Amino acid sequence: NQLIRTSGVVTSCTGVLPTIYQNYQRIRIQESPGKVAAGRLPRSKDAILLADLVDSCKPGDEIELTGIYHNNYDGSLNTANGFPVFATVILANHVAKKEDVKMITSLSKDQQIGEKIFASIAPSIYGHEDIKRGLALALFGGHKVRGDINVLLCGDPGTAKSQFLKYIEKVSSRAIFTTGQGASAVGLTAYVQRHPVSREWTLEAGALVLADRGVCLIDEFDKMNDQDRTSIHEAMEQQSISISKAGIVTSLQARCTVIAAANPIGGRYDPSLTFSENVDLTEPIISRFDILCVVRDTVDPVQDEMLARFVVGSHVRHHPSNQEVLKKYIIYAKERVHPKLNQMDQDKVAKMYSDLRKESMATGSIPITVRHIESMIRMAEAHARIHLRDYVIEDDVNMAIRVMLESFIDTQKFSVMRSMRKTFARPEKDLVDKARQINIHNLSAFYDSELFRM
């Protein structure tokens, strides 16, 4: 019974859904953001639209909600469901329609701290050199200028390696653990349940919507149910729902960086049969992984020695005995750095990678796909975003080479030790290749003066 000031985000609209119940509709709203202090689970809001703000609300509006919480519980007739602990009917009254940052920013441009920054990226376990690259790319998360990152890990769940992704939420702003089946409410997958005579069908709001222009973290991806796979297969391809029948049109935004880790089925390579050729599953779902990394070395007690002492030392600190400055340095950078492109140097950048493709076509029969390259070009993008030095050093060149060699190990039989020694030791699709020869992405660049008129 008091006017309350708060904030919230509109997530979805219910135009796509089909007389007492018809007066109102149902929407899924959260208030608590991702934070270390917000670790305890909060009480979710369920707002009711009384046919007033329908079709006027669009996703991505960081708006403020103000009103009074009257507990005018309309379910006195006991013919519906009920609200959580915050037992009150929530009405909508405010939706808009149309510093330490500076001190850190001063240190951000400084090059003295810009040198040791990539030598402290992974202090928890020190991991593997490839993982840090994936983490750094994920931290920045970088018209139709979009992209997705598939970071792969090869371990086992019993070791905390499976739990290594848990440490990301300390740095990430939006992390939700699915654990597979029976996740928290909606686990990014849409499902249908049987409802009584008078209740509202559920519009499934995934964490995909809640992290618009954000980052969404997925754990235990391969332990999800087979049924969920069928629904999610189509949405992941387009990161939205697009219908072009010109009769029914709608769009639902899902633009987070899909971060997930695959779990090997049983043993690593105990069976003696082929890995790629012995799969009954569907091709397009498996082929969503851009990089297929293999583990390097098996028995290294010296490397394993360091981790054990970390555990022992860690347990010491927790027993009784009688730095946000560094967290936000990388995160804030991805919002301010937006360099421009030079027209006379655009060809030279794209020229270098094109040469590497045609080399692989000499001895073979189209054995390399452009799609793998398609991820590699966006990966180099963060390099310029970090240093802004206009060139790439040869030190980084060696590291990116190790990415590709691991991929060939998994797909090819161990006989890769004979044919690929030299690299290791030292018609719609055809038209796409044609564009790389001229270094022009736009296929409608002829008479672009008349497109501006329209």
**Contact footprint for another protein (CB under 8 A):** 156, 158-159, 268-270, 272, 294, 298-299, 304, 307-308, 311-312, 315, 409, 414, 425
Coil, strand or helix at 257: strand
Q: Is 45 helix (H, G, I), strand (E, B) or coil?
A: strand
Three-state DSSP class for residue 61: coil
Q: Least Å distance between CB 306 and another protein? A: 12
Q: Give the residues across from 4 on adjacent strands.
A: 67
Minimum Å gap between C-beta 127 and another protein is 15
111 among annotated binding-site residues: no
For another protein, give the closer residue by CB, 77 or 311. 311
What is the SS3 assignment for 50?
Answer: coil
295 or 432: CB nearest another protein: 295
Q: Closest separation between CB of residue 311 and another protein, Å?
A: 6
| Tokens read off for 317 | 């600190």
CA distance 81 to 79: 7
Whichever of 414 and 446 has its CB closer to another protein, that residue is: 414
User: Hey, what amino acid is at 175?
Assistant: A
Single out the residue of 258, 441, 267 nearest to residue 349, CA to CA: 441
Q: Nearest 5°: CA angle at 68, between 67 and 73?
A: 125
What is the amino acid identity at position 73?
A: Y
Q: Residue 263 in contact with residue 161, Cβ under 8 Å? A: no
Mark residue 81 as left, alpha or beta (left: phi above 0; alpha: psi -120 to 50; beta: remaining).
beta
| For another protein, the closer CB: 19 or 272 | 272
Residue 100 phi, psi dihedral angles, 5° rounding: -65, -20
Give the nearest distance from C-beta 404 to another protein in angstroms.
Answer: 18
C-alpha distance across the termini of the chain, in Å: 54
**Is 163 within 8 Å of 271 (Cβ atoms)?**
no
Q: Which is nearer to another protein, 354 or 407 (CB)?
A: 407
**Comparison of 185 and 307: residue with beta carbon closer to another protein:** 307
Which residue, 46 or 406, has its beta carbon nearer to another protein?
406
156 Cβ contact list (under 8 Å, min separation 6): 162, 264
Q: Which residue, 85 or 312, is less far from another protein as judged by CB?
A: 312
Burial (CB count within 10 angstroms: exposed 0-12, middle 13-18, buried 19+), residue 169? middle
Rg (CA), the chain: 26
Instruction: Fill in the DSSP letter of residue 416.
Output: H
Smaller CB distance to another protein: residue 308 or 432?
308
Task: Check the annotation: does 163 bind a ligand.
Answer: yes
Residues in Cβ contact with 100 at an 8 Å cutoff, skipping those fewer than 6 apart: 325
Q: Report the alpha-carbon distance of residue 92 to residue 65 in Å, rounded.
A: 7
CA distances from 102 to 35, 106, 131, 335 (A): 22, 6, 31, 14
Q: Shortest distance, CB of residue 366 to another protein, whole angstroms?
A: 27
Q: Choose between 382 and 409: whose C-beta lies nearer to another protein.
A: 409
Task: Tell me the closest approach of the beta carbon of residue 300 to another protein, in angstroms.
Answer: 9
Count how many Cα atoms sit within 13 Å of the Cα of residue 437 in the half-sphere of its side chain.
6
For 134-183, give the DSSP string.
HHHHHHHT-------------S-SSSTTGGGGGGHHHH-S------SSS-
Candidates 50, 78, 81; CA nearest to 202 is: 81
Task: Extract the annotated binding site for ADP.
Answer: 162-163
Task: Extract the annotated binding site.
Answer: 162-163
